[PDB]
Amino acid sequence: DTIDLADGNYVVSRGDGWILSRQNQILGGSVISNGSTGIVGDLRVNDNAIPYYYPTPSFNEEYIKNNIQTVFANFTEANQIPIGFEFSKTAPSNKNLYMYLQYTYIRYEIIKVLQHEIIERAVLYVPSLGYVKSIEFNPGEKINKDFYFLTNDKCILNEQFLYKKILERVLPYSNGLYVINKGDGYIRTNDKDLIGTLLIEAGSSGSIIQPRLRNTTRPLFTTSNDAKFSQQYTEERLKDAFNVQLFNTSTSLFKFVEEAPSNKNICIKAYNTYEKYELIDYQNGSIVNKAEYYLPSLGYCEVTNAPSPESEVVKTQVAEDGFIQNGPEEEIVVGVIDPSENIQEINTAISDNYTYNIPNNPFYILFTVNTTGIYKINAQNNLPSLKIYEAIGSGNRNFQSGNLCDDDIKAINYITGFDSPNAKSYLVVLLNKDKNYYIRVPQTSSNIENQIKFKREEGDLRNLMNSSVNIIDNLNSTGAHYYTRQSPDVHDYISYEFTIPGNFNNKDTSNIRLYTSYNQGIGTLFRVTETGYNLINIQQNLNLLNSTKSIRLLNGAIYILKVEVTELNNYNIKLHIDITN
Amino acid sequence: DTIDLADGNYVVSRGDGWILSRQNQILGGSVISNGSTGIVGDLRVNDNAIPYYYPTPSFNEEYIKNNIQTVFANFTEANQIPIGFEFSKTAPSNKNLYMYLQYTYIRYEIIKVLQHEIIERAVLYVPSLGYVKSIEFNPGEKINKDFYFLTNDKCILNEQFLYKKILERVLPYSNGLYVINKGDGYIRTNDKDLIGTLLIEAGSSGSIIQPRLRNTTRPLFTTSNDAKFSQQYTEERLKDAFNVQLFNTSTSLFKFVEEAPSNKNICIKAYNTYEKYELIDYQNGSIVNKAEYYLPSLGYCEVTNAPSPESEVVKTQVAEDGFIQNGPEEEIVVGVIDPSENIQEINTAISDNYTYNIPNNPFYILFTVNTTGIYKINAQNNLPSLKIYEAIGSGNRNFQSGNLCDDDIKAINYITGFDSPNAKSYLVVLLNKDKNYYIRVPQTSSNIENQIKFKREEGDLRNLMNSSVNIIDNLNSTGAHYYTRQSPDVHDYISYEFTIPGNFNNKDTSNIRLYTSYNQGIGTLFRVTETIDGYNLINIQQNLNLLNSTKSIRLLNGAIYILKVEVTELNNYNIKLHIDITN
Amino acid sequence: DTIDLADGNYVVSRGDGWILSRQNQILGGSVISNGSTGIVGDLRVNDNAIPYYYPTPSFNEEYIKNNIQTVFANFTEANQIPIGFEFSKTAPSNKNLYMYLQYTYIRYEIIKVLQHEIIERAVLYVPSLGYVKSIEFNPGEKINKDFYFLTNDKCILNEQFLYKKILERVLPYSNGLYVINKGDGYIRTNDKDLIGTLLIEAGSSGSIIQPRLRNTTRPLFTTSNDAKFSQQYTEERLKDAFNVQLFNTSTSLFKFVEEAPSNKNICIKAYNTYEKYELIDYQNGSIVNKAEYYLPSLGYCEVTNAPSPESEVVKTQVAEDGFIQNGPEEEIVVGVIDPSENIQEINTAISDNYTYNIPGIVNNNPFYILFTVNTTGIYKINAQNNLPSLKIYEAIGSGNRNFQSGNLCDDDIKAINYITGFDSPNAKSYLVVLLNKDKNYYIRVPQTSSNIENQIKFKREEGDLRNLMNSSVNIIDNLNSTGAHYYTRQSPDVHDYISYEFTIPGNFNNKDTSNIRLYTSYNQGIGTLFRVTETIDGYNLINIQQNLNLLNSTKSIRLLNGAIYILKVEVTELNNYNIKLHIDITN
Ligand SMILES: CC(=O)N[C@H]1[C@H]([C@H](O)[C@H](O)CO)O[C@@](O)(C(=O)O)C[C@@H]1O
């Protein structure tokens, strides 16, 4: 026939809901009477789900299968999983109803177009779901032959003609591993995840069913790097983040049931779905490795008013390969222990003071504290810089007074600390007694003993709460200095402890310009009196971006500036300490 | 007791719905509360489908079993296939309900009658489905013992007493095969296909379930001739006709659900059903072989207001073996390719002209045409007579411009042609471009070369469409002539081409009386005037009504005429045209 | 925290309905739209029925498991049997709904308390059922993280705190065996038979399902003596009584469906249940042997308003082990043939007379005689000289099936309704009983230390003896003089009869009398007194006193010396297992 398409070969979906010549009653039917309900159903499986190919000299079976499976639903992978369906009809209160069952199919075609004419067409019918036809009858009644017997193939829904030409944001995340739940109800384009379509006539019911007769599910997986982020590695990380236990099996049942009102015909399309997880290796403000894992989920059901079988068919082009999300928007970001980095434990709940010895690759220390309190945590001479995380949902399970219970959690929430191994720093942090925490100690280039010290702070240092504290040690006589670190998020703090150059006579003073380069924030500056440490507040509410303001500070005296980020413009925060006469 | 039955031994069904003394609560029950619905059910199979025999000296267990199974439902056969049932009850807001399950049974009996007295009685209870009784209750409430505990066997339905004394049409079809769908919802007499009955209490619901826990179905099959129509051959024929694929298995579930109103108890009975196919080998007006295939189908359920468990029991004799149809009237006739006959193909679509060389036995030629048109199809000198069929549902699938696509259809509607050795004919038929067709060439007795000629007709010959034209030769100058052929069906056509005797001079005539003997029909008469691209037809008389017609008409000597007959009344398998000449 | 408990180790149930940190969405969810219904559920078995242990030095996995399973539901045994659950939600017109599935757990704890402080806690999450949360959303719209993601474990129901400290009526029945159905819907205390709990969101539906993927059930049995009443013996008694066949399997399906109103969330608790059977050996007024047999049944569904999860947790001691009946009140008492006693049969239906000869040895064992009669009527039945005393029972449900004119049909029924007769080694009596032609009866002859030849006589009675229908008649034969006399027998039940045939002392001359005081001691009854006259036409009971109120009656009557009277007693107040009749004779 005639067609407005450039010359070439096209794969075509003509839609679901096709029934086949002559094959109407081959499954039998039911006779119900007098207000009773009949429910007839079936299960599309291996042996009753036979595709029927109608090839042509240019388009053989193989060519057809390949071109259809490339663009449309892969019916070979789909056909080992039993999918059920059922229809319900109620008989009138003084009449008999005859209902019979027929398999439906999707019609695919391969067409050759020369000069706006289709000069060859191959057809493939792919098993889909089913259709019930019923009629009310009395003894005697002559019923039209066509109720029982179809002379020519046809669609019980509206036909389609969907074709394809055949050819030939600052993320201030700490460095580490993240698993992100990006939400549910993902399907692929072009009906690749279509289970099937039922036509549910007025005052009847219809169901599409996943009964888990087999448990097999089919996850979808891609990776920027199969050496680091293999499928198995990605599954282990999903396990660490969300305790996903089953990847390619499920016992979880789903089905969709639709009762069509009086005087309305309904179309129910049912789809397989996935829940989309991202596994990212995040370093220095960028994605270094990324894997996508589409976990098999529990379906999507589209209900439309059933259009005419007869309305005109609009030739439409297929979408690009890809995914459509039909579930709600969602982004859950969960850090995970890097399994290449070993976990050491402190079994004693920390009291007031504790010292952990370190005989080397990065590793974690798991620990808890006896009483909620602010803690200073540092290595010896403040090297290396540490990070600390919360084990997520820890501390709600097993407990023992004065000791650690490892409740086995590798989902971690970053609190504070830099990925600057060789920067001097100490952490100051509020630690809740009913949680477990991880210290991360980075890669050291050393032979020496090192120690992590934990000290409950009950003094002024408390006012540096939830802060890493950088120790500046290279303040020259005058001139400009900058210190670049990973920026904390908005409302999160970073702190700098520095000695003004020169000898202390309590009289000699230098001018100090404290400003940031990219990010806005609030500074609180404090004189250190060295009791622990006493902090005298000497400048509040400083506003740091590009600030020109100047303050005079005592030579050889020690100060700490606390910075609350307020504007996150850049992954990095760069503090300047410029000193003059 | 007294009974009005002649002396002898009888098997009796006293019906379904029997419940057994003391065994009320041995399956347990459910307690539901405060708006919740409880659903209790079971599955009748193997171990819980063990009958209870109660023999007497004259009637042992083998004798009870055999006599019961010969006349009523075979309970051994049916035990294999799990049948399910369930009952649903909703507790009212803020009350508690108790619902308990009991199996029901069919009670069979063997009785010996003498001088109108039952002197001996054996009993068999065959497990059927089950029954749930419910009661609302308050804490500490006294319940009647009879609610919980039955002291004597009884029927919860009306009893039956169905007994048996123990001893000691013109088919105008072309020769070939036909499968016929005679409809759905068939059952055997005497409750042989009864699945079961539920009593459903007011304000509750009940279901009978075929869950396909095993897939086995049981077709019923008869044949006149297992040599030719075996079961397997009959099944392949069904496959050819309707693409039937599964004969003794099914994944198709069926279930019946009934909700009793507030004000009455309901009875639901459910039956296994069959769809009935007839396969016939039809030759020269008679059925020569015939098999019946009863394909397992998806059930029948009958819903009655529950009769009173104390209404009058009327003694009734068992019906003859047979089938009742509870589905709607249906007759679908599908011709099928005879598998013993080979298929050849013309691979190029026919346009204006084609000559097919015949490579003997009957065979088919599968072919298509390029553009819907009228075709004249004949063999050399019109011998032998050919037939032509439509492949049903062909042409809607694969297509290639100018060529045949075989969509492998063996289901055929006859269009026209004769089974008639020695009778010269040619076909004139409307062929649609989006169908394939089968020519059938019959058994030929000669070893000379023959060709099938195909010709697109653009002119008058189009007036003969959907008919075969019998060539009649050598009418004599005076008196009676007649020709018997297979009758077309009502509204189909047969044609005759005949030459008036005598020399053509465009003037001399003879008086021609045209009539049929048995069947009624309408005759259109054409005079043939011949050109070198084929015949011109002059319609000289329409609506001649042919049965024993006395009308005559003067026709030109030496001239060729064609009579096209539309059959209007099919009284005889054959039609007989008379040509009686006077003047 | 601080805790008002005494020192020691405790097992604690913190309730069903716990959901776990982070795992909320790992089974997937469903998106439904427009009018459609989504039904999401699962099946709790082996791989997804694995517990999560969080142990401590003092409380290891095995200690936790064992101490929990002792007091609370045994999840290891219940782990084999698939229990199904499903939730159903209907998306409104022109809207989309997302609904996701999460497993629920019972949270159990072992705690060490010292000085009103919990100093150690181990935790066990046992897989229970599941929970489906749903939300309305628009395509492209965000939902808050807390809908999707739980940071800390919590209970979606109200929590509980149920702890246990860990430590390292006259029965007027004839002598014989009885199986008693005490009713249905029994569960054990402390949620030992809890199948699971569903929180059902407003406007949705939830269902708990026993689909019998496995057929196994688990009866509960306890006996006072395993030598007499073993489990096998008790089951065989249940078979005799109610024809119970399957004790530890079932193909019987049950499921509960609960639809929550538009307005409130609902909580459904499903339980396995049992039917309580008592097997007793009853002798001279006392239960001498007893078994209890809890036969697995078809469950119990309790529907309650979903209590707030933020509800005040009140620390409560567990109940003692035992049972709670949720089904309706029921007591069905079925006598059973004692299998230690032999059954003889009279194969011919009895007509108007029959004699059945009984042999004697030094020590005759008790035995039964199964028989039937040809004509409905009243029968007199006794041994020779009315010794020993006999009992008669009806075979329950007999006579409804196989039949052969004139013969007994043994329809094999060991379930028996006591009609009348005494267990009294020393009492002479005969029986007077309405027998139905369409029924089998059993006579029980007791153990007799006699070795004499005896016979059981059966006689159809059409005269006055019918006034005594359904009683035993005690032959008193020691009224040898003036003086106090009493006679202790098993009391009939209320509205049943006991009779007494007695001869006044002295020579008969139709004139002489002595004074007779008739009364009972413990039970009230109504007496009818007849003179027995034996004339040419035959025998007659002459009614001489009616509606005599016997309990401590001070009425006295003059009765003829050497004449025979019969006192029929209808028991009206069953105060005592025995009825004590006095016959005090003065001049
Ligand atoms: C001897 C007498 O007058 N009465 C006695 C009776 C009878 O001898 C028997 O019961 C007859 O069967 O026996 C008793 O045990 C009793 O029944 O309480 C004690 C009572 O003193």
UniProtKB/TrEMBL annotation, chain B:
Q: One cellular component GO annotation, for this chain's record? A: extracellular region
What InterPro entries does this protein's entry cite?
Clenterotox, HA70_C
Taxonomically, the superkingdom here is Bacteria
Domain Hemagglutinin component HA-70 C-terminal intervals:
450-583
Protein name in the entry: HA3
Source species: Clostridium botulinum B
What phylogenetic lineage does the species belong to?
Bacteria, Bacillati, Bacillota, Clostridia, Eubacteriales
